[PDB]
Design a protein around this ligand. Structure first.
Ligand SMILES: O=[N+]([O-])c1ccccc1O[C@@H]1O[C@H](CO)[C@H](O)[C@H](O)[C@H]1O
Ligand SMILES: O=[N+]([O-])c1ccccc1O[C@@H]1O[C@H](CO)[C@H](O)[C@H](O)[C@H]1O
Lengths: 330, 328
DNA sequence: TGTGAGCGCTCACAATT
DNA sequence: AATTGTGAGCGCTCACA
C-alpha cells in the first residue's frame, strides 16, 4: 500500500485534480488552498508515482543509453557526465549496458530502452556503418545519438577528432626526430580503436614513415605490457611508440622498463586519453586529452535538441589536444 | 502514437487479452493462433510499453541504486556488476547518482528513486550511522541494502572485510621487518576510508608499532603523489607505506621514485583494491584484492532475498586477499 | 479463447463559487 | 473571472462468459 493522489484528497478535503494541480506547480490555487495541500503531502510522505505520470502523458525528458560495459574506463566517465547533465536540466536517464558481443546484443539494449518509452537514445556501443544504420532504424520515431561509430557513418554522432588526436601524436614524435616508430592499437573490434590506428597511418604516411611494428591490445594495461614484450623480444625495438590509450601505454612503459631501457630517452611513448592516473605514471605519460565530461555533456544537449527537432543533424567532432609530459623528451 | 495492444487487436483479428498471453507466455499454448499474433506484432514492430505493464501490476523486479559518482573507480565497477547480475536474473535496474555532498543529497536521490517505484534499493554512498538510519527510514515499505556504511551501523550492509585487508597488509609489511611505517588514508569523508585507517591503527598497535606519518588522500593519484611528497620534504622517510587504494599508491610510487629512492627496497608500498592497472605499475604493486564483481553480484542477490522476506537482515562481510607483488 | 474490471496519474475541460 | 470538481482514458494485466 503506497500513497495515492486520492489519499491527499481525503486527508486535505479537496479533489484529486487539485492535488495534481499543486504537485504540478500549476497556475490557479489561491495560495491559501495550497497550504492545505502542501501541508497534506507532508504528513503522508507523498512521492508521486512517475510510472503513473509517464503513462498519463506527462512530458518528462527520458534519455535512454545503450552503453559498452561500465567496467571499462571511458564508457564509465561518459555515462557519469551523461547522467550529470540530465539532472542539470531535469532529465532522467535509464541505461541498458550491452555486455555480450555484436549487433544483436546491442539491438536488444535498444529494444528494452524503447520498452520504457524513452524520448531518444544515446548509443555508446561500437557499431560498423551498416549495423549503426540498422540500429538507428530500430529507434522508431525517437532520435538516436551515436558515440562509437565513424565520422563516415551516415547518421548522427559525436566523436573526438581522432584525426586531430593522431596528427598531434605523429607530428610530435616526427618533430622530435623519431623514425623507427611502433603502433599499439586498441582491440580491432572497437570502431574508435580502428579510427586511431587509421589516423596514425594517414599522418605517418603523410610524413614518409612506416611503423616497424603494429600490434593489437584490448585496452587493458596488461595487454599493452604483453604486447610490448612480444615485440621487444622479437628484437624489433622502436625509438618511439604510439599507444591507443593511457592504460596500455602504462603496460608498454612497464615492458620498456623491465626490458632494461628507459622510457622517454630510449623509447618514447605517447598515450591516449589523459586520465587522472596518467599524471602519476613513472615517468608521467605524454598523452592526447579527451574530455569525457564534455562528450557526455554535449551528447545530452544534442539528443534533447534532436528530440525537439532542431536542425543539428549528422556528425560533429569534439576537440582533443596534446598533453606534453615526460615520456617523449631527450 | 506508437503501436498499442488495441492495434494488434483488429489487425490479427482478435482481442487485447489474446496478444497479452502471447508476449507473457503464461498458461496455455493457444493453438496455431500464436503463429498469427507472432507475425502480427513483429510486422509493426510492437514493443510492449513497460510503463503500462508496470502500472497494471506486472511482477517485474525493479532495483534502485543510489551511488557515488561513477567517475571514481570502485563505484563504477560495482554498478557494472550490479547491472550485470540483475540482468542475469531478469531484473532491470535504475541508478541514481549523488554528486552534491551530505545526507540531504542522498535523501533526495532516494526520493526520486522511489517515484520510479523500485522494489528496494542499493545505497552505495558514504553515510555516518545516524544518517544511514535516516536514509533507511525514507525508503518507505522497501528494503535498503547499504554498501558504504560501517559494520557497526545497525542496517543492512555488505562491506569488504576492512578488518582483514588492514590485517593482511600490516601483518605482512611487519613480517618483512618493517618498523618505520607511514599511512596514506582515503578522504576522511568516506566511511570505507575510515574503516581502513582504523584497521591499520588497530593492527599496527597489536604489533607494538607507532606510524611515523599519517596523511590524508582523496583517492586520486595526484593527491597520493603530493601527499607523499609533502611528507618526504618534511623529513619523514618510512621504509613502508600503507595506502588506501592502488591509485594514491601510484602517486606515492611516483613521489618515492621522483625523490631519489627505489620503490620496494628503499620504501615498500601496499595499495588497496587490486585494480586491473595495478599489475603493470612500475614495479607491479602489492595490494589487497577486493573482488568488486563479487560485491555487485551479492548485493543484487541480497536486495532480492530482502525484498521477498527471506530473512537475512543485518550485515555481511566479504573476503579479501593479498596479491603479493613486487613493491615489498 | 473473449469481457469488464482498475492500477495512479494528466489531460481535457464542465461545475462550483 | 476567479476557483475547483468531474468526466473521460493512457496502455496494459489482472481474475472469470
Ligand atoms: O570508444 N569510445 O566510444 C570512446 C569515446 C570517447 C572517448 C574514448 C573512446 O573510448 C575508449 O574506450 C575504451 C574502452 O571502451 C577505453 O576506455 C579507451 O581508453 C577509451 O579511449
Ligand atoms: O568505498 N566503497 O564502498 C568501497 C566498496 C568496495 C571496495 C572499495 C571501496 O571503494 C573505494 O572507493 C573509492 C571511491 O569510491 C576508491 O575508488 C577506492 O579505490 C575504493 O577502494
Amino acid at each position: 500500500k503506497p500513497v495515492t493522489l486520492y489519499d491527499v484528497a481525503e486527508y486535505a478535503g479537496v479533489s484529486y485534480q487539485t492535488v495534481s494541480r499543486v504537485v504540478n506547480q500549476a497556475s490557479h490555487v489561491s495560495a491559501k488552498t495550497r497550504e492545505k495541500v502542501e501541508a497534506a503531502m507532508a504528513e503522508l510522505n507523498y512521492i508521486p508515482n512517475r510510472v503513473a505520470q509517464q503513462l498519463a502523458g506527462k512530458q518528462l525528458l527520458l534519455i535512454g543509453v545503450a552503453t559498452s560495459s561500465l567496467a571499462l574506463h571511458a564508457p564509465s566517465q561518459i555515462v557519469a557526465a551523461i547522467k550529470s547533465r540530465a539532472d542539470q536540466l531535469g532529465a532522467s536517464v535509464v541505461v541498458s549496458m550491452v555486455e555480450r558481443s555484436g549487433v544483436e546484443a546491442c539491438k536488444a539494449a535498444v529494444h528494452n530502452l524503447l520498452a520504457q518509452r524513452v524520448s531518444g537514445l544515446i548509443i555508446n556501443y561500437p557499431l560498423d556503418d551498416q549495423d549503426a544504420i540498422a540500429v538507428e532504424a530500430a529507434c522508431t520515431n525517437v532520435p538516436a545519438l551515436f558515440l562509437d561509430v565513424s565520422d563516415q557513418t551516415p547518421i548522427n554522432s559525436i566523436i573526438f577528432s581522432h584525426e586531430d588526436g593522431t596528427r598531434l601524436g605523429v607530428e610530435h614524435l616526427v618533430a622530435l626526430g623519431h623514425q623507427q616508430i611502433a603502433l599499439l592499437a586498441g582491440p580491432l573490434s572497437s570502431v574508435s580503436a580502428r579510427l586511431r590506428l587509421a589516423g596514425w597511418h594517414k599522418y605517418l604516411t603523410r610524413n614518409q614513415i612506416q611503423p616497424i611494428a603494429e600490434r593489437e591490445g584490448d585496452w587493458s594495461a596488461m595487454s599493452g605490457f604483453q604486447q610490448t614484450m612480444q615485440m621487444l623480444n622479437e628484437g624489433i625495438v622502436p625509438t618511439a611508440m604510439l599507444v591507443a590509450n593511457d592504460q596500455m601505454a602504462l603496460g608498454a612503459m612497464r615492458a620498456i622498463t623491465e626490458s632494461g631501457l628507459r622510457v622517454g630517452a630510449d623509447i618514447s611513448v605517447v598515450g591516449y586519453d589523459d586520465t587522472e592516473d596518467s599524471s602519476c605514471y613513472i615517468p608521467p605519460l605524454t598523452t592526447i586529452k579527451q574530455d569525457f565530461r564534455l562528450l557526455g555533456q554535449t551528447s545530452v544537449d544534442r539528443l534533447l535538441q534532436l528530440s525537439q527537432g532542431q536542425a543539428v543533424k549528422g556528425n560533429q567532432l569534439l576537440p582533443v589536444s596534446l598533453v606534453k609530459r615526460k615520456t617523449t623528451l631527450a
